[PDB]
């Protein structure tokens, strides 16, 4: 052995080194310095036809040579196993080891290749000289070290395909893939091994041929002539073999005569040459350990996995070879022997006398027998290594495609007789009345042994669970003083007993964790490295295929499989689900408590009986706290201090605070805790206000309100104590501190890190800032109190759940208005913000006053109703015919009462004279009116509402079409808290824009559907462009006004939520402010329609006609995480917010039931988008053309993240629903499949399309496009192509949430390290460093808390268990912090491991605060920020 390591290189013309190091044989053709075609149909052995030649200054070091030899060995093993030169399965892998030995000797050893063998040896010598350039020890030493390393390593890859048998001490696989040491070395002269192989082949051939001849001699009944001819031929072969043996003897004698550390192989060969010349089984214990050579247990691969029930170990077939006991000793004899064995084993099964428990045992025994006969068993007691060999030998002489398929067919054919003979059957009939009535003849149980063992173990556990819970509930059914505690204690001991039946004396949690790990590994193996999936011409039988079927169905985790397989809820009879997870404190058996979460049945006490078995009060407080809703993570006569330590990391003294020539000490920790609390509680209150059985909901909401009130009171008292202490020896006021916190929170989100000139604010933004944070005077306490009051009234309002006069006589003054139509001079928008056309002309021609106003409003309402009834295309959507299809259920026109409300609001504002922009003369009129003249206003408003209701009733009476008494869409007045003047006008403008856009789109599609343009499309497209420009100006003005008024909320969501008309319109795209929008898309999101052209993607080999038509904008680095546009506690990384999704919208909207073209259209669009994204991302991550490997790695990581995001969005597994993504997903669902088809079918079709073509798949096409983009980026700087970008194979993408968390932690660690290095090296710059540190760290604590909560929600859930129908069974991590361990410990590789953090320990939760890592620079930052806060308050005042 030697210490020289190898197989550690990376990106050496291969995939990646991360794939390796797991002791696997996944090496592909790549990674071996090249990207075996030589295959055949003194001595001439077959070594030439079982050898490869895949083996000058291009190799870096011995890593490449080792990889090449490993690839050669793997290819040779694959060729030998797949070719199957001898399917008898008796000796199939001996040739494998012989070829391995020959290849080993080929490396500067005994060379017998007669031919062009000079190139190989020359290349080997050149490689040896190159690797020997470093002189360390005086050629042979390095060669022997490399040979030993190869013998130790290649033995674990070449034998990764053959799993028939071996001779040697383990079995079930030739060689030892996991023994970690060589089994048998063929260190013998090549001549002797070749002779042995030749004689073995001759013996096998002659033996089987003479056996076939003997069978044929009797098969018939000129056979004698052919018999004699074959005998003569075989005599000729025998004499030829004798002559060859004589030649070998002559050669041996010649070598002996010639013979009468310097090629040690030859020395040993000559030394060896001179030496030669000179039946009842007791119960079992559920073996949970690996089986040894002469010991029971699971196989090597299935280490510590599901155990073996006593029934399997008591099977008679697992006693000896296939030979009966009472006997002294054909194709049909096998069936008779099997039937006898089954009928004699069934008496052994009669031990359990039952009518329900025996059928399942018989089914399990039958399935185990089938799996053992097939040759896929794992229980593997002391009597299996020989049984398989005997079965193979028997089948070779009776049936000698493949042998495994033959065994499967034989089992499937004879399972009927095998099952019928297991029910007391002696006289086999042709094929109830038998000894048992388990089930019908078939009793299909074709399931892998692992799942059946898991089900049997689960049933065994559930039996004991039911037995215990029966006694527990029989005594604790609401009756428990002292006789009930014993039952609960005994159940707790049974469930957690680190020492009942099964588990081999160990906690059930460890066994469950091992089972879950194995199930996840099987899922990954059947999902990642399995290309031959289901839907194949319904897999017949295979473990990987069955696991793929399960993954497609959705039972990804073992819990769902157990829940579905188990029926009748027999597990305890308490109705305890197997999907819900229960967490208990810890297990004392084998001082420190560690929370353990397991399936509900396991748990720690009876399901739904937690804190009930001890015979105390229900404790509604804790019972609801367990609900995991409305939770506050805080644990708030001396009256000294109340730290209110955050749940988790405890408060630790700084040890750097001193009272000598300083301000004070021991109070900075309280200041930081208060700073975190005043923001966390504010965010929680805002979230609960944004958010809406309800009796318990508000009970817990009020409990949380009281808790936060108590916390606030304690914090106020502690802050008063701190202020008194400071005054003892100046600190900002508490209200001033709250005002500063509000201002800082408002500024950080929008302004770039506390913008210098904060005074420069929008004219309307001042009103919002003063209303939210407060006025000039400090009133933080009042604002907090009002917020709490609003929160309380939230539930307080939530928990609550004649007219005869004829007014139609004064028809004068107002006539038919000139609406926006030609039914016999049309107005237009005038953009205060805007003036809608309807507001310009009303029934105000008349202008005692109250009656006149009432009559005017009645007349205008009647006129509007009549006009809407007549029909108009200004606000109502209708086809060419008109008045059809679009009909309100009430039977009234569309958008009528909205207009009535709008007009009423305008009248109210006019009579009130608010800040409304109107004609100057109207302004003077209303000014004079309000000079001439607020309960009476409300009374008059009620008067108009009653008059409108009476008018509606009169209209209904005169029409008699439906029932309408003033409740067409609501009787109550408009209750919109927000101002209804600017917002109402904006909403009306948005509705009109939606209607006009839909009309124009319909006209274009119906008139410009059927290559330049020469019809009438020019006029339509030009009119649409002019309209789009006008509405773009209007939208810009209105959006600026809204942002100045409401700087927090956006306009797109508000305009698209209250109007289903704009669902296919993207304001961010239709009104793009870029320059390419007027050149590449001059038609406004309809270029693909007006142009009627076709899109195409050009590869690297194309001419100057490249693809530079995109709307991609330079990536920004000064963004922050936002949780907007999401369908809880999940934040979007900055990368996803900059992906180019503009080019997809035109093609998405263009296609409708046109998959035939939409397929390639979307393919080209996605390729172009991915190319542009890769270009921009690599440019952003490699600025100024710096040749840094870290920059390339980060660019590759961003590329992989973006590519996975694109895969998820195409597959419909995306989390965010942005303006583009929402419509993209809607149209993708509409196109693929149909309305009748379910969403699951559409998702499966999309996944199939993304994976397969139905040359190259779309995955590879997008990858190639992105590499082409990276190359176009690189050619601009004339640098080397990144090595992390030339990899084709990529593993399956993990859930988007996990990738987001990994990116978040990577960015957090990078920023933390940068800021800490900046501060320590300089800390009079402490102020800026401390301020930036605090500002960057405060949001991160909340982000991490939310991400950890979401992780704990679905940490190990599945499709039918998690919040969403996504896959999360690959997590296999107890807590979020533990998952980042082993994943963010090493350096960046660019493929998988792309997070570096020197915080692996449990410090992320503490690093979020300033308890420990910021202790040395806590007092300085605090005492120098205090003056910053004071100056900010002074400037604000």
């Amino acid at each position: 052995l030697k210490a020289d390591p190898s197989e550690v290189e990376y990106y050496r013309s291969g995939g990646d080194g991360d794939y390796l190091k797991n002791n696997i044989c996944k090496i592909t053709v790549n990674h071996s310095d090249s990207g075996c075609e030589k295959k055949l149909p003194i001595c001439v052995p077959p070594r030439r036809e079982r050898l490869c030649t895949y083996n000058f200054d291009k190799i870096r070091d011995n890593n490449a040579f080792l990889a090449d030899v490993l690839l050669t060995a793997r290819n040779e093993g694959e060729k030998i196993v797949q070719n199957h030169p001898d399917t008898n399965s008796s000796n199939v892998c001996n040739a494998l080891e012989r070829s391995f030995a020959d290849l080993a000797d080929i490396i500067r050893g005994t060379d017998q290749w007669k031919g062009t063998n000079s190139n190989l040896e020359k290349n080997l010598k050149q490689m040896f000289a190159k690797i020997r350039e470093n002189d360390k020890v005086l050629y042979t030493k390095l060669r022997e070290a490399w040979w030993n390393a190869n013998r130790q390593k290649v033995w674990e890859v070449i034998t990764c395909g053959a799993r028939s048998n071996d001779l040697l001490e383990l079995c079930r696989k030739c060689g030892h893939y996991e023994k970690e040491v060589p089994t048998k070395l063929d260190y013998v002269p090549q001549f002797l091994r070749w002779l042995t192989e030749w004689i073995e082949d001759f013996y096998r051939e002659k033996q089987n041929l003479i056996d076939d001849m003997e069978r044929h001699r009797e098969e018939c009944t000129s056979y004698c002539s052919t018999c004699k001819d074959k005998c003569k031929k075989y005599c000729e072969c025998v004499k030829k073999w004798k002559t060859e043996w004589e030649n070998q003897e002559n050669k041996y004698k010649d070598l002996y005569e010639q013979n009468k550390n310097t090629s040690r192989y030859d020395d040993y060969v000559k030394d060896f040459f001179e030496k030669l010349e000179a039946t009842s089984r007791s119960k079992k214990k559920w073996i949970w350990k690996k089986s040894s050579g002469n010991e029971e247990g699971l196989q090597e691969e299935y280490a510590n996995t599901i155990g073996l029930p006593p029934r399997t170990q008591s099977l008679y077939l697992g006693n000896l070879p296939k030979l009966e006991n009472v006997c002294e000793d054909g194709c049909l004899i096998v069936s008779f022997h099997e039937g006898k064995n089954l009928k004699k084993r069934y008496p052994q099964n009669k031990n359990s006398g039952n009518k329900e428990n025996l059928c399942k045992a018989l089914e399990y025994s039958f399935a185990d027998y089938g799996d053992l006969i097939k040759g896929t068993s794992i229980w593997d007691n002391e009597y299996t290594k020989d049984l398989e060999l005997n079965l193979q030998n028997n089948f070779g002489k009776l049936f000698g495609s493949s042998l495994d398929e033959l065994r499967e067919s034989w089992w499937n054919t004879n399972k009927k007789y095998i099952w019928t003979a297991m029910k007391h059957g002696a006289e086999m009939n042709i094929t109830t009345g038998s000894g048992s009535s388990c089930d019908d003849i078939p009793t299909i149980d074709l399931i892998p042994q692992y799942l059946r063992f898991l089900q049997e173990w689960v049933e065994n556990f559930c039996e004991q669970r039911q037995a215990k819970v029966k006694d527990v509930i029989t005594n604790c059914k609401s009756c428990c003083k002292t006789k009930c505690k014993d039952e609960c204690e005994k159940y707790k001991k049974f469930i957690e007993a680190c020492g009942g039946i099964g588990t081999a004396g160990s906690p059930w949690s460890k066994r469950w964790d091992q089972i879950y790990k194995r199930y996840s590994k099987h899922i990954e193996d059947a999902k990642r490295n399995r290309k031959a999936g289901t839907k194949n011409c319904c897999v017949q039988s295979d473990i990987d295929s069955f696991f793929k079927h399960l993954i497609d169905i959705g039972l990804t985790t073992p819990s769902s499989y157990l829940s579905n397989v188990l029926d009748d809820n027999i597990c305890g009879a308490d109705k305890a689900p197997w999907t819900t997870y229960t967490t208990y404190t810890t297990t004392e058996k084998c001082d420190t408590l560690v929370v353990v979460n397991v399936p509900s049945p396991l748990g720690n006490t009876p399901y739904r009986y937690k804190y009930a078995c001890q015979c105390k009060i229900p404790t509604n407080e804790e019972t609801c706290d367990d609900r995991k809703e409305y939770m506050n993570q805080w644990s708030c006569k001396n009256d000294n201090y109340e730290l209110c330590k955050y749940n988790g990391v405890d408060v630790k003294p700084t040890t750097v605070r001193s009272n000598s020539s300083k301000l004070d000490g021991n109070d900075v920790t309280f200041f930081n805790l208060f700073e975190q609390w005043n923001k966390e509680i504010q965010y929680q209150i805002e979230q609960y206000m944004t958010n809406a059985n309800c009796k318990e909901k508000c009970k817990c909401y009020k409990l949380w309100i009281e808790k936060i009130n108590d916390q606030w009171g304690k914090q106020k008292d502690n802050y008063n104590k701190f202020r008194s202490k400071q005054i003892y020896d100046k600190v900002v006021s508490l209200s001033n501190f709250l005002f500063f916190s509000c201002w800082e929170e408002y500024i950080q989100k929008y302004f770039n890190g506390d913008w210098s000139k904060i005074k420069n604010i929008g004219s309307d933004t001042f009103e919002f800032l003063i209303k939210k944070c407060g006025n000039n005077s400090a009133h933080g306490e009042e604002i907090f109190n009002e917020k709490l009051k609003n929160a309380e009234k939230k539930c307080k309002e939530n928990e609550s759940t004649s007219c005869d006069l004829n007014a139609t006589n004064y028809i004068r003054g107002c006539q038919s208005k000139t609406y926006d139509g030609k039914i016999f001079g049309e107005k237009q928008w005038i953009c205060g913000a805007c003036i809608p056309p309807r507001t310009q002309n009303l029934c105000v021609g008349e202008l005692l006053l109250k009656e006149k106003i009432k009559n005017a409003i009645h007349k205008e309402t009647e006129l509007l109703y009549e006009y809407h009834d007549t029909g108009t295309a200004i606000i109502s959507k209708n086809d060419k015919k008109g008045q059809k299809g679009k009909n309100d259920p009430n039977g009234l026109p569309k958008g009528f009462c909205h207009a009535v409300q709008r007009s009423f609001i305008d009248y109210k504002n006019m009579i009130l004279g608010t800040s409304v922009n109107i004609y100057e003369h109207i302004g003077k009129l209303q000014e004079d009116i309000k000079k001439i003249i607020n309960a009476w206003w409300k009374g008059i408003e009620r008067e108009m509402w009653d008059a409108v209701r009476c008018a509606i009733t009169k209209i209904n009476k005169k029409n008699n079409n439906s029932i309408f008494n003033g409740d067409e869409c609501g009787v109550s007045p408009p209750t919109g808290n927000d101002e209804d003047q600017s917002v109402s006008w904006f909403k009306e403008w948005g509705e009109q824009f939606c209607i006009e856009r839909l009309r124009y789109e319909q006209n274009i599609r119906e008139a410009c559907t059927i290559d330049k343009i020469q019809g009438a499309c020019k006029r339509k497209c030009e009119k649409y462009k002019k309209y789009i420009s006008e509405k773009k100006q209007e939208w810009d003005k209105q959006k600026t006004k809204y942002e100045n008024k409401y700087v927090g909320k956006s306009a797109s969501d508000l305009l698209k939520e209250n109007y289903p008309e704009c669902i296919s319109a993207n304001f961010d795209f239709i009104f793009n402010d870029n320059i390419e929008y007027k050149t590449y898309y001059p038609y406004g999101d309809y270029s693909s329609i007006c142009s009627c052209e076709q899109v195409k993607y050009y590869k690297y080999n194309n001419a100057e006609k490249k693809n530079n038509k995109s709307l991609c904008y330079e990536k920004d680095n000064d963004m922050t995480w936002s949780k907007k546009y999401i369908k809880e506690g999940v934040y979007v990384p900055p990368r996803r917010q900059q992906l180019c999704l503009y080019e997809l919208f035109p093609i998405i909207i263009k296609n409708e039931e046109g998959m035939e073209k939409a397929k390639e259209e979307l393919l080209e669009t996605l390729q172009i988008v991915a190319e542009r994204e890769a270009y921009y991302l690599w440019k952003q991550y490699n600025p100024t053309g710096k040749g840094i490997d870290d920059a390339n790695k980060k660019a590759c990581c961003a590329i992989r993240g973006s590519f996975y995001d694109l895969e998820d969005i195409i597959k419909g597994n995306d989390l965010v629903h942005d303006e583009y993504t929402k419509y993209i997903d809607s149209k993708l669902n509409e196109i693929f499949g149909s309305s009748d088809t379910n969403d699951i079918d559409t998702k499966r079709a999309r996944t199939d399309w993304w994976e397969n073509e139905t040359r190259k798949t779309i995955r590879q096409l997008v990858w190639d496009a992105m590499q082409s983009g990276v190359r176009y980026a690189v050619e601009e700087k004339n640098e080397n192509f990144p090595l992390c970008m030339g990899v084709e194979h990529i593993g399956i993408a993990k859930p988007q949430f996990i990738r987001w968390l990994e990116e978040w932690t990577n960015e957090f660690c990078e920023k933390y390290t940068k800021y800490f290095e900046d501060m320590k090296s300089k800390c009079i710059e402490c102020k800026k460093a401390c301020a930036n540190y605090t500002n960057w760290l405060n949001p991160k604590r909340i982000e991490w808390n939310g991400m950890s909560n979401y992780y704990n929600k679905i940490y190990r859930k599945s499709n039918k268990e998690s919040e969403g129908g996504k896959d999360y069974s690959m997590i296999m991590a107890p807590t979020v912090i533990d998952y980042l361990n082993k994943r963010c410990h090493g350096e960046i590789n660019g493929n998988y491991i792309c997070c570096s953090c020197k915080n692996i320990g449990a410090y992320n939760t503490t690093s979020g605060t300033v308890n420990k890592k910021l202790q040395k620079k806590e007092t300085e930052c605090e005492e120098e920020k205090g003056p910053l806060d004071l100056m900010n308050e002074v400037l604000n005042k």
Side-chain angles (χ1 to χ4, degrees), residues 53 295 337 499 547 972 1068 1161 1164 1260:
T53 307
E295 170 63 340
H337 305 164
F547 273 95
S972 50
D1068 187 71
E1161 271 305 358
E1164 299 287 54
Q1260 292 294 346

Side-chain angles (χ1 to χ4, degrees), residues 590-604:
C590 81
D591 59 357
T592 70
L593 60 88
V594 54
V595 304
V596 179
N597 46 8
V598 286
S600 281
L602 310 180
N604 194 0

